[PDB]
Amino acid sequence: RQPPEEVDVLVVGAGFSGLYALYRLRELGRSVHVIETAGDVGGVWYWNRYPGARCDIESIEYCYSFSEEVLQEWNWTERYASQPEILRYINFVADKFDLRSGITFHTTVTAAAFDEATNTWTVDTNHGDRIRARYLIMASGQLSVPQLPNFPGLKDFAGNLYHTGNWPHEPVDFSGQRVGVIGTGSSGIQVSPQIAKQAAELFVFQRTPHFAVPARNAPLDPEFLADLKKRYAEFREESRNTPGGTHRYQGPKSALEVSDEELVETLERYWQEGGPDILAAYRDILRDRDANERVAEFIRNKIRNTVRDPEVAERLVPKGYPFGTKRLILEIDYYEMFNRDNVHLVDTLSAPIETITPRGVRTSEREYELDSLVLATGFDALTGALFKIDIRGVGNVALKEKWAAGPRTYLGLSTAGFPNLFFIAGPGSPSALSNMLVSIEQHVEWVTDHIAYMFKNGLTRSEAVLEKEDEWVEHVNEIADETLYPMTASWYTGANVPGKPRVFMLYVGGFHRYRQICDEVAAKGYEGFVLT
Ligand SMILES: Cc1cc2nc3c(=O)[nH]c(=O)nc-3n(C[C@H](O)[C@H](O)[C@H](O)COP(=O)(O)OP(=O)(O)OC[C@H]3O[C@@H](n4cnc5c(N)ncnc54)[C@H](O)[C@@H]3O)c2cc1C
Ligand SMILES: NC(=O)c1ccc[n+]([C@@H]2O[C@H](COP(=O)([O-])OP(=O)(O)OC[C@H]3O[C@@H](n4cnc5c(N)ncnc54)[C@H](OP(=O)(O)O)[C@@H]3O)[C@@H](O)[C@H]2O)c1
């Protein structure tokens, strides 16, 4: 489009979160419009088009549930949907509900300011648009600002330079190239086996080794799909009533109580079945360091037995941090890749990168000559997208400033001093610790219900109570401190961005309990919010 001067609700972001908000707000009888930087819908599945890109949550879980028609119609094809497929899904939903007529594309919001006189937001874009809106919904993502390390050589590299979160829209040809991949999180583990098949030589620059387990992907049986469809709302209600927003089995035992022989036998069953459910095999894997370590060691042994050169294998073995505290990764022929002659593991812990050079990468041991260099170096997560926008609350406080020692929220949904502003599936909430379609739908519903409630009662200003926000922040840190999550440098704590404050940013109590807390809050008239 071309955006309206005035609107009840402005939404930023046209991925999963913004599309649903735009959908539900129209149903609720509210004027609403979306501004999005990308050329089209999809959010992470529009930007992340690198080869091998693929979801780690089963296709049947990772999908919308607000529309029965969508659930009956869509045909998923495999256990874990590839990126192109998930993008076809999102295009399908966008077409079905005519969503694009409410979205300005190619447009980046740059500043937003709350106006105490009118109880409204004024939102500016990089095209010179100015929009006035009663409420502001930031659906701008969790993993939406690419993080490029500030390596000394970078702007001098004479080859082709890429980042997996901003991938060309036409396939890139690596045939006969020497190619370097920096980063071995889920992006790098998924991209490298694809590049390994085209490149003359592939150098995988690893820092901390991450734990990954086999995906065991497979065709989805069309019979099973037809069968699921008969009870689809029931199946999703079951997933909503869990810590993780999926059908993972919640292992009741402690990893410490079991004999060696029972532990091997349980873990081996998880490993053969494939997928991430091993994380919840015993109740204390994320709570107790001796529990965690008996599982970790099982995993490190599978890695040693997968790679034939034991020197290379040992370099791949994760050390230094508890299993499950960086995101657990699903791999498809990633370890086996290192048995190819043309694939090299460069351990940068023992040989740190000193600089990028015109021809390649220099570590303390040698220089590597490369035609292309792929950064799988992640995202300035959870706060990176909000921080790129000049957002100003009451008394002209900048959000960037209030949150400079870490995000401060009530329920993650709002921050005090910034009335009428909501963050979708961000810091202070379950967010990426659960299936994100479950986190996102529940936030979009709770916020849009809240906005409908304000118009219904002729209220115009919603603001979190400062003391409740402070209590909520404290609570989030205290329950996080009963787990091993804060022990490790991950994007969850911000420790991947130099200078970023190190605080575990997510609610760890599980989706289900959080959902309960949010319903209790709404049921009592939005206790902990002041409305006028
Ligand atoms: C490659 C990858 C794979 C994933 N795999 C899974 C999975 O297996 N499990 C899981 O549960 N989740 C996974 N995620 C997490 C993912 O973030 C969520 O599942 C979900 O897609 C987030 O949707 P969103 O709408 O909340 O944000 P996004 O998908 O990131 O959408 C936000 C949009 O806002 C736009 N935007 C940002 N700032 C501005 C601005 N200033 N002005 C205008 N527009 C702006 C962005 O361009 C983006 O399009 C994955 C993440 C990535 C990066
Ligand atoms: N399959 C999927 O469903 C999928 C795919 C991609 C992304 N995602 C989501 O998005 C998240 C991020 O994935 P990601 O792989 O893009 O990023 P990541 O998990 O943040 O990993 C970034 C990688 O780059 C390395 N790195 C960062 N800075 C570096 C530096 N200065 N020098 C050398 N190495 C550096 C990190 O090393 P260290 O660990 O040593 O810091 C790590 O190996 C995932 O955890 C998941 O939530 C999901």
CA of residue 255 to ligand 1 center, whole Å = 34
- Bridge partners (DSSP) of residue 106 are none
Q: 273, exposed or middle or buried, with CB in 10 Å at 0-12, 13-18, 19+?
A: exposed
DSSP per-residue codes, 66-125: S-HHHHHH----BSS-BHHHHHHHHHHHHHHTTGGGGEE-S--EEEEEEETTTTEEEEEE
| 8 A C-beta contact, residue 507 and residue 435 | no
Identify the residues whose C-beta falls under 6 Å from ligand 1. Answer: 12-18, 35-38, 43-44, 48, 53, 55-57, 108-109, 139-144, 385, 388-389, 424-425, 432, 435-436, 440
Count CB neighbours of 65 within 10 A.
Answer: 18
The b-or-e profile of 144-183 (16+ CB within 10 A means b, else e) is bbbbebebebeeebebeebbbbebeeeebebeebbbbbbb
Experimental approach taken = X-ray
What is the rounded distance in angstroms from the CA atom of residue 510 to the CA atom of residue 197? 40
What is the rounded distance in angstroms from the CA atom of residue 11 to the CA atom of residue 444? 11
Which residue, by CA, sits nearest to atom 37 of ligand 2? Answer: 207
Cα torsion angle, 399, 405, 408, 412, sign: positive
Q: How many CA atoms lie within 13 A of 38 on its CB side?
A: 25
Long-range contacts of 80-85 (CB under 8 A, 24+ apart): 80/54, 80/55, 80/56, 80/215, 80/217, 80/330, 81/54, 81/55, 82/53, 82/54, 83/45, 83/48, 83/49, 83/53, 83/54, 83/55, 84/49
CA of residue 44 to ligand 1 center, whole Å = 4
**CB-ligand 2 contact for 55 (6 Å cutoff):** yes
Are 419 and 493 in the same domain?
yes
Tokens 């529009």, located at residue: 46
* Number of the ligand 2 atom closest to the C-alpha atom of 57: 3
**Two structure tokens written together for 513:** 């309990």
| 8 A C-beta contact, residue 430 and residue 518 | no
Are 170 and 138 in the same domain?
no
382 CB-near residues (< 8 Å, 6+ apart) = 142, 407, 426, 427, 431, 491, 492, 494, 505, 506
**CB-ligand 2 contact for 208 (6 Å cutoff):** yes
Are 501 and 422 in the same domain?
yes
Are 371 and 240 in the same domain?
yes
CA of residue 141 to ligand 1 center, whole Å = 4
**CA 337 and chain centroid, separation:** 26
Q: Nearest Cα to 283, choosing from 316, 248, 308, 332? A: 248
**Two structure tokens written together for 374:** 């792929």
Are 222 and 292 in the same domain?
yes
Are 348 and 414 in the same domain?
no
Q: What angle do CA 393, 396, 401 make, to 5 degrees?
A: 80
| 8 A C-beta contact, residue 338 and residue 310 | no
- This structure's resolution (Å) is 2.3
Q: Nearest Cα to 387, choosing from 48, 116, 145? A: 145
Q: What angle do CA 94, 424, 122 make, to 5 degrees?
A: 90
**Two structure tokens written together for 8:** 């009840």
What is the rounded distance in angstroms from the CA atom of residue 502 to the CA atom of residue 487? 10
Q: 85, exposed or middle or buried, with CB in 10 Å at 0-12, 13-18, 19+?
A: middle
**CA 345 and chain centroid, separation:** 27
Domain end point (choices 363, 379, 395): 379
Domain end point (choices 334, 355, 379): 379
Q: Nearest Cα to 432, choosing from 484, 374, 485, 471? A: 485
* Number of the ligand 2 atom closest to the C-alpha atom of 164: 16
Residue type, 103: I
Q: Nearest Cα to 424, choosing from 136, 37, 33, 159? A: 136
| 8 A C-beta contact, residue 206 and residue 376 | no
Residue type, 31: S
Residue type, 210: H
Q: Nearest Cα to 49, choosing from 167, 183, 187? A: 167
Are 249 and 364 in the same domain?
yes
Q: Point out the ligand nearest to the CA of residue 376.
A: 2
**Two structure tokens written together for 311:** 């020197």
Q: Nearest Cα to 160, choosing from 437, 373, 443? A: 373
What is the rounded distance in angstroms from the CA atom of residue 36 to the CA atom of residue 15? 9
* Number of the ligand 2 atom closest to the C-alpha atom of 491: 20
DSSP secondary structure code for residue 404 in this structure: B
| 8 A C-beta contact, residue 330 and residue 215 | yes
Q: Number of folded domains in the chain? A: 2
Which residue, by CA, sits nearest to atom 35 of ligand 1? Answer: 13
Q: How many CA atoms lie within 13 A of 148 on its CB side?
A: 13
CA of residue 189 to ligand 2 center, whole Å = 9
What is the rounded distance in angstroms from the CA atom of residue 435 to the CA atom of residue 61? 8
Q: Point out the ligand nearest to the CA of residue 43.
A: 1
What is the rounded distance in angstroms from the CA atom of residue 468 to the CA atom of residue 474? 10
Q: Nearest Cα to 194, choosing from 337, 13, 309? A: 337
Give every strand in the sheet of 160-163, ordered side by side. 160-163, 372-375, 178-182, 201-206, 343-347
**Two structure tokens written together for 489:** 């440098």
Which residue, by CA, sits nearest to atom 44 of ligand 1? Answer: 36
324: left (phi over 0), alpha (psi -120 to 50) or beta: left
Cα torsion angle, 334, 339, 340, 343, sign: positive
Q: How many CA atoms lie within 13 A of 143 on its CB side?
A: 21
Are 71 and 197 in the same domain?
no
Are 274 and 393 in the same domain?
no
Count CB neighbours of 248 within 10 A.
Answer: 19
Domain end point (choices 379, 413, 433): 379
Tokens 């812990």, located at residue: 349
What is the rounded distance in angstroms from the CA atom of residue 86 to the CA atom of residue 62? 9
297 CB-near residues (< 8 Å, 6+ apart) = none
| 8 A C-beta contact, residue 158 and residue 359 | yes
What is the rounded distance in angstroms from the CA atom of residue 526 to the CA atom of residue 520? 8
Residues found in the chain: 532
Are 451 and 413 in the same domain?
yes
Give counts: helices (H), strands (E), the chain.
16, 20
DSSP per-residue codes, 137-177: EE---SS-SB-----TTGGG--SEEEEGGG--SS----TT-
The b-or-e profile of 363-374 (16+ CB within 10 A means b, else e) is beeeebebbbbb
CA of residue 437 to ligand 1 center, whole Å = 11
Q: What angle do CA 40, 41, 43 make, to 5 degrees?
A: 115
Are 187 and 268 in the same domain?
yes
Q: Nearest Cα to 376, choosing from 423, 318, 408, 334? A: 334
Are 20 and 143 in the same domain?
yes
Containing structural domain, residue 25: 1-149+380-532
Query: Could you give the dihedral angle defined by the CA atoms of residues 13, 454, 407 and 133, in that order, rounded to the nearest 10 degrees?
Result: 40
CA of residue 204 to ligand 1 center, whole Å = 26
Residue type, 123: V
291 CB-near residues (< 8 Å, 6+ apart) = 254, 255, 256, 282, 284, 285
CATH of the domain at 518: 3.50.50.60
